[PDB]
Ligand binder design. Sequence first.
Ligand SMILES: Fc1cccc(CSc2ncnc3[nH]cnc23)c1
Length: 167
Amino acid sequence: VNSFSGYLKLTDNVYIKNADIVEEAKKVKPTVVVNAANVYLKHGGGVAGALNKATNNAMQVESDDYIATNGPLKVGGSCVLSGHNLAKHCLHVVGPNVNKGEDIQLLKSAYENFNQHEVLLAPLLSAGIFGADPIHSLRVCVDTVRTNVYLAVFDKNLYDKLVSSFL
Ligand SMILES: Fc1cccc(CSc2ncnc3[nH]cnc23)c1
């Protein structure tokens, strides 16, 4: 039993809700919140810009030190950093950005990072400003993640389409 509330159950392990991931994180304080990161951990917009803003830029400060030490992530890769005031940990996951020409096949590799964590609050990877089809992202999530994932979908219209079209 966990503290996530109001989710529709899609499969044994995947759940979905129309919610703002920032407000959802502030309420649940999950062990892991997933960020829709880029390889430079530059949290300018989309989910990343919103999560970072909610931390009063502390996420960005921590991220800049991480990059200065370790260099950029790989597309499809991840790193674990602090969750600041939102969660215990933030798993920064880089899905392919279609608006940069990146291989959509890397979306499965990106979701594989979720399997290192028993429970996560997450957005749909590569959706939104990353340019991929969210219906496809949900399919890859369900077919790749085996741990318990609670997906927050900000746009109510998109949420209804994802549910109604789910196989
Ligand atoms: F549109 C809104 C309305 C309320 C709050 C936010 C910030 S969080 C966010 N931003 C972008 N994509 C997302 N997918 C899941 N959560 C998010 C955005």
